[PDB]
Structures are given as structure tokens and as C-alpha cells.
Amino acid sequence: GTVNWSVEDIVKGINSNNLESQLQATQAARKLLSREKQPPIDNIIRAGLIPKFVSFLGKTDCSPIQFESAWALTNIASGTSEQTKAVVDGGAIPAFISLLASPHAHISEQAVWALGNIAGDGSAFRDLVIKHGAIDPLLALLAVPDLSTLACGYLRNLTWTLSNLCRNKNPAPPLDAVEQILPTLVRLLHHNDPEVLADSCWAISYLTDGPNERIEMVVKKGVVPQLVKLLGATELPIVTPALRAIGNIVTGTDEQTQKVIDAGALAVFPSLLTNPKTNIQKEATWTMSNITAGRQDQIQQVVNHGLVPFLVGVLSKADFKTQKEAAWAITNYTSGGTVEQIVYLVHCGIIEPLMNLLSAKDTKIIQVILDAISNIFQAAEKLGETEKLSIMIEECGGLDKIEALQRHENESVYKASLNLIEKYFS
Amino acid sequence: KRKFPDSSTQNSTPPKKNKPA
């Protein structure tokens, strides 16, 4: 019917002076462009069809050709940045924003989708979509008393498009647009659909990825408790962005971090630090490292929740990227901790896995570990126990590793290892 | 305190979605 047309035939139909012929050819293009196997996007662009599709978006009197053109353009804009740019260059942004008000839900939804692809291209097109006024009509589509009366697919596509308006940095989204979107995001974060939850979590994770003033705008909306609840979900597509957002938040101030602790986040970390997905373990250990970079009373909460043995665990056995994050967690803990906290750390068994990791090729982790060792010796000095520690490091092979590190290409490694040996192993 | 770099990846899922047949 409209299946498997050539681009030449599509062009002949769209260039006819016959609206129904144009509609049939546009539908044929839509079908070509929605085939999984190598849709001929560049041929359609080269044939000059984007401006015709864009003008069809304005044909209020023929809603089927609005829909077919919107779909075709959606799939072109889903391609490379140069393909998305061809759509933008054809004037698509304001035409799609005008379609957001369509009385036909499948057309408004297609416009939502196209704008999500355009904005998802990167900061510049995101910001251009915002400048053409997309946020007001997008948010109006969600101004219903109960989100559950909306079609599920429709709500998921709106949530995803909103998340692309929150995505990307250099620059981050405009502050005023973030403040305009955030109350709707907060509402979507309490909706009962797993895809809506995952994508509104991702949006929050984007918005907390930056300076502490962005973190603050999010935390002030009171979402940390809901994020902690989602952190405890069974669905990995929800836990993943929830954990990224929580981790981002604890990169901020001591007070921002404290909101995460206050909300009960630490009780989830026995599972996260042993999670079967390596990326979850890595990001949870990164998060812990930012918490152990906090105040002594926050380190103490880590202790109270039983998480130091879990850190020992990941230092002992985990993917190497996770072990690096654990090494950071230990260096921060030893930098900021009380003497009693550092003693506890040693009694949980940190020394041996810490030493075993000095045989690693990564220079930065060696530096991190040597700083931690030095911090621990400084705690031992205040107790006159430097000798017991030296013995402990000797019994597990750590002295050999420090010696060998003296002969290390990097300067900081050589210096720190030589200082350690001369000061505690001579 | 260690943030993600500005060059970091916010999401391994790409931002764009095609609408399949």
C-alpha cells in the first residue's frame, strides 16, 4: 500500500498538488523511516523533504498528515546530530511546539517525542527548544488532578522529554527553566509507573550533577526521602538513577549530605555495596567516599550503620574501578576521622586489603593508598602504637610493596614510600 | 568530595529514541 516506496516515489507524491497524494507519500516515508534495518534518513534529507514535512505539521485541516509528518521527522531527529540539525534547520521547533496544543492526543504525543529528540541532541538545541517556549505547553499537558487518568505511553513520553530538558552540561539547563520544571518532576517522582519513576529519577540525577547551588535547588523541594525510597526499589532501572542522584547530592555541602543520611540512605548500603551489578557497587562506593569526606559525626553514622566492614569487603574483592572508589573512601575516612574511628577501621581489617592494592598499576590509587597509610600512622603516633602498626603492615607483605614503590617512576609515590620507610620501617 | 567531571556521562542510555513500526 504505502509499504516499500522508493524515495523517488515519495518525492513525486509530496510534490503533487494533491493533499491526499501528499498524505500517502508522507505515510510511505514514515514507514521507510521506522524500519529498524538502516532507515534511509540521509536519502530523505538529500531529497529535500524536511521542509515539506515541516509545512505539513501546520495543516490543521488534515490531522493524518500532521501525524505522519510528525512521526517521520521524529525518526529523522532521532539520528545523528547532523540529522537532528536538518530537522531544526527546517523550522521544526516552533511547528512542533504549536502541535503540543493539538486536540488529537496521538499528535500532541508525537510532538512531545520529536521535541525530546531535538532537546536530547545537546545543550544548544535543548536551550533553543526552551527559548521557543516549549516548557509551558509541555507542563500544561500534565496539569491534571491525577496523573493516572493519562495514557501510560503518553505520560512516559512526556516524562522522558522533560528529562531531556534537564539533561546535559556545558552549560547546564537555565536556572529559570529548572525552577519551572522541578515541581512537575517532584510530582512524577511519586507516580506509580516504573518507567516514569526511572526517568524522573534520571532528570533529578541530571539536575544534581553540578555546583552545590543546583543541588540545593533540588534538595529544597524535599525530594531526598522519596529518592531514598526509590534507592530501595527492586527494579534496577529505578535504583540506578536514584543512586546517581543520591551520590550527586552527597558531593555537596555537609548539610546537603546530612539530608541524605537523615533520610535513612545508609540502611540501604549493605545491599548496594554487595549488589550483583558492578556499576551499582561502583557508584555506591563512590557515594560512600563522598560521605566519608564529611564531618566526624557523618563518619560516625557510617560506623554505626555497620558499613566499615562492607568497605573492607569491596577493598578486598570487587571490580578494580570499585576498589579505586573504596580506596578513596578509606583515604577520606582516615583524613577526617577521629583517632577512635581510625582505630576501629584498623580493627575491621583494613590494612591487609589496603596493602594488597599497592601492587596495582594505577598511579593515582597508589598515591591514595599511601596517603591513607600515612593518615593511619599519624593516628598511631598519638597512641604510641606506630610499632604495632609497622608490624601489622610487615606481616601481610605491605613493607615489601612500599619498598618496591620507592623504585617507582612517579615522584609522589617514590617520596611518600621513602618517607614511610624511613619514618616507621628503619 | 569528588564530583563527576563535566565531560562525564550522565546516562549510558542515549538521549534520542526512534519510534519503530
Author numbering:
A (entry chain A): 72 to 497
B (entry chain B): 124 to 144
Question: What does the publication say?
Answer:
At least one functional cNLS was identified for each HPyV LTA, except for KIPyV and STLPyV, where no functional monopartite cNLSs were found. We therefore reasoned that nuclear import of several HPyV LTAs, including those from STLPyV and KIPyV, could be mediated by bipartite cNLSs. Strikingly, all other tested cNLS peptides bound as bipartite cNLSs (NLSbip), occupying both the minor and major binding sites of IMPα2ΔIBB with their upstream and downstream basic clusters, respectively. As expected, neither STLPyV LTA cNLS nor KIPyV LTA cNLS targeted GFP to the nucleus, in stark contrast to both STLPyV LTA NLSbip and KIPyV LTA NLSbip, which conferred strong nuclear localization. Intriguingly, both GFP‐STLPyV LTA NLSbip_m, bearing the K124A/R125A/K127A substitutions, and GFP‐KIPyV LTA NLSbip_m, bearing the K119A/R120A substitutions, were considerably less nuclear. Indeed, both the upstream and downstream cNLSs could tolerate mutations impairing their ability to bind IMPα autonomously (gray orange bars), preserving their ability to simultaneously bind to the minor and major binding sites as a bona fide bipartite cNLS. This scenario is exemplified by STLPyV and KIPyV LTA bipartite cNLSs, where the upstream cNLS has lost most key features of a monopartite cNLS.
In the best characterized pathway, importin (IMP) α bridges cargoes bearing basic, classical nuclear localization signals (cNLSs) to IMPβ1, which mediates transport through the nuclear pore complex. We combined bioinformatic, biochemical, functional, and structural approaches to study this phenomenon, using polyomaviruses (PyVs) large tumor antigens (LTAs) as a model. We addressed this possibility by x‐ray crystallography, and solved the structures of putative bipartite cNLS peptides of MWPyV, STLPyV, WUPyV, KIPyV, and MCPyV LTAs bound to IMPα2ΔIBB.
